[PDB]
Design a protein around this ligand. Sequence first.
Ligand SMILES: Cc1cn([C@H]2C[C@H](O)[C@@H](COP(=O)(O)OP(=O)(O)OP(=O)(O)O)O2)c(=O)[nH]c1=O
Ligand SMILES: [Ca+2]
Ligand SMILES: [Ca+2]
Ligand SMILES: [Ca+2]
Ligand SMILES: [Ca+2]
Ligand SMILES: [Ca+2]
Ligand SMILES: [Ca+2]
Ligand SMILES: [Ca+2]
Length: 901
Amino acid sequence: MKEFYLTVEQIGDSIFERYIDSNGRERTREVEYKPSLFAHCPESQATKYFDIYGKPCTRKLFANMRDASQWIKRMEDIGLEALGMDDFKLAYLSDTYNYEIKYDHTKIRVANFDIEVTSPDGFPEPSQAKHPIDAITHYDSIDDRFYVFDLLNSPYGNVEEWSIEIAAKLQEQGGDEVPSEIIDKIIYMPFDNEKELLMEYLNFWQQKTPVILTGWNVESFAIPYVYNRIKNIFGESTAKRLSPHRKTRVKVIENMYGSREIITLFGISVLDYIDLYKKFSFTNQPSYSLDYISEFELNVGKLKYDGPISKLRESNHQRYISYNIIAVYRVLQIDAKRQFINLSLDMGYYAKIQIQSVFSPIKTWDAIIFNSLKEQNKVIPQGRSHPVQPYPGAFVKEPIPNRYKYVMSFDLTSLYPSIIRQVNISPETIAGTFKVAPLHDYINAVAERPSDVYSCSPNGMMYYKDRDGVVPTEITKVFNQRKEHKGYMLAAQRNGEIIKEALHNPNLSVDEPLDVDYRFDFSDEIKEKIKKLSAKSLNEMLFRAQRTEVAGMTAQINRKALINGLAGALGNVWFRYYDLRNATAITTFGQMALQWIERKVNEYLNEVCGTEGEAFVLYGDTDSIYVSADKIIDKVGESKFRDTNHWVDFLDKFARERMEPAIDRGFREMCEYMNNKQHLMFMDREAIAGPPLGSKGIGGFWTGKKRYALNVWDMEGTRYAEPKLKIMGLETQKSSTPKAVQKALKECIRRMLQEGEESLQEYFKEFEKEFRQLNYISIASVSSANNIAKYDVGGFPGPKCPFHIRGILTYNRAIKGNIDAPQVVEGEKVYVLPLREGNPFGDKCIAWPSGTEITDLIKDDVLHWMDYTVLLEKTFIKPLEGFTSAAKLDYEKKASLFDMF
DNA sequence: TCGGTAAGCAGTCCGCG
DNA sequence: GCGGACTGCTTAC
Ligand SMILES: Cc1cn([C@H]2C[C@H](O)[C@@H](COP(=O)(O)OP(=O)(O)OP(=O)(O)O)O2)c(=O)[nH]c1=O
Ligand SMILES: [Ca+2]
Ligand SMILES: [Ca+2]
Ligand SMILES: [Ca+2]
Ligand SMILES: [Ca+2]
Ligand SMILES: [Ca+2]
Ligand SMILES: [Ca+2]
Ligand SMILES: [Ca+2]
């Protein structure tokens, strides 16, 4: 097999690399890598090296990496550009793996771990590590085993061994319900004392050294805790054994409000799963507890235990250990579903970076572009300092707030990367500038043609047309990967709908789910077999189709994110190729494209309808348009349609056979106007929306920019078994909105769009009557909580104190003098409830850590004093008033002359 | 929250005769 | 009461 790296580090004048050799073995080597950098040279000097602008460069070979770094400094002192890859480990990887890397995940040691630490005096701070580590569960992907290290004797209590037999039993048998499928994979090791536990853990770590290290909050908690605890007990040298090269560094992570410390383990790639999840999941959750996320992702119930976690080991060590094991497994289950580790390996190996660098698109693109240019003996420019400067982005049309009955939407494929490719936007393809007219003049095609030679953007920029720039070349490669995975995602989605349809008529039989590849549209044969399957088999197939859809979604949306990241990286001062000329060329072209096609679509539809100045495009945001289809439907007449699906088919056909060709013609003209390199503005139909045929549903409504709801029957070619609400921006979509309130508002919207005013009024009346019975957590608001300290004046709200911060301050007074009470953590999320006048808490609201029950110390008083009237008005009525006024509907029945009867 | 812009709503403070 | 200036937070793209 072809070799591939696992990890790489620079330590002084050495590269330390762990890798898989040609025989599939893990090896480590130390290499005295001599790096090269570049200076510009006279044209009279023969060279094969040229900078991206075609200027000749001489290669400087250094005796060692320190010399190269010192040279960079002296070049700054002189005032001359020092060209080339200054991150020498990336240059090392580029030289050592000068081919497309094919990696074998089965040879990569991926470790998932979690620790337990009993703490009687509050949160056990990892920088202090003053409490014993009393459990570690460490799963190894190569062994496929959960290694459990269990401390039996501690100053906080001596306990009996954990029982695998009790662990396996149902919770109804008094067991812990450790999943049967991992029971045979547990290797249990009890310890007489913590020193022996940790010494054996380190020996184990030496034998089975993680390449990828993950878990939940491992970077912020588990790793620094283990490191600092071992340091405290044994000294620094022993703690550094967590690194295969015995090198660690405290790294200070800074944000706007303060800083925190993590431990960098040289020769390990830490991918904390909480951070993978935050980056790659495209959710915003009210809590990031593993409990909360596991329930969301897997539909597994909360891990139940009595009393505080600080007393769990002494009261129920059996459950304590089982829950530690289950916690590690839950992350594995989340990854089996989401496949973020797979994604990270794919992207990291593609770019030729340390795997942990996938968190940074700037670093990822720096490496991709460097490797690409190096192939042509081209030389990358030096990174430079730039002041942060604001620049313009997308256009968003102001909609007329209203109901909108029939709506077809259209959206441009991968807009920003497609603009880069079409215009040929790259650092080295800049050709010059032209004199700009107001944007409106380009939109209406009255401005003079910018250039007859170069490819243009309406920001004034001109680009070469003779050859693709490196940015277009490389962005295209990742776009093509994205397109492939999106194809799989949509097939799995369509396949899912086939199965949902079949589930209307399940067969009474005992059978098996079909062995099929859900990434490809089901054949006629598979379809016929599905129609004969039991509900059991169909539901299993549906689960599998949905899992395939999720895998496709991960792979496509994050490749989309990567390529979009390149567009914005051009506007990030830390990117080697930062250039606001290029960043603005993208965004300004985007504004033009949207408003240009708005004009073209209005002109086309006024022509088909035989009208003048009528606005068919009701809304657009960045690269989408929403078209009112009422007039199209009315031209055949609602009474001609057999059912909802009939008019959906009709609009689908109209969009594909009439509108898309018109749109294409409009964009081809725009391409010629800007003299672009290649026409790549592909705007395809997205949604078909409307009320069910014969209903009083309103179909859709807008309240303003980025705030709308549509009843969708078909989305990008997926014809739904049941209509799906597409709601954007409204409170149903906001993590700050109480859970039960999101649910209620969604049902109000569903009724509005599908059933009509009377249905809405019926539901509103019921919700208003019954909502006080809702669990307090389900009706609590949610907010991130920053700068608690800033607004804290002696335990009380300072000037301009935000509402949620006031709530935290109230909580802090109510729990004062309790080291055991859960503390609100700066920067994390809280639940927030309003409090009635005259409550014992002395203020109008209270807040506590999100994803948790409020401490029993104050729970009953919170429940007693919760202000239901305020909560309802703020989170439910006010947003509903907004929806209904926009939709020109009433949520309460108005008096009429009929009431006299 | 270590890892591009546009733009909405909650809430504080305070004006608005 | 509502709206502007401002802070804070959140989502759409
Ligand atoms: C969603 C999203 C969009 N954008 C920018 C870049 C996108 O090209 C542009 C339009 O957004 P989108 O229409 O959401 O995405 P897209 O056009 O890139 O891809 P798709 O084929 O799925 O429609 O907005 C971001 O910068 N970050 C983001 O997270
Ligand atoms: Ca735990
Ligand atoms: Ca798009
Ligand atoms: Ca059937
Ligand atoms: Ca879009
Ligand atoms: Ca098309
Ligand atoms: Ca203070
Ligand atoms: Ca206001």
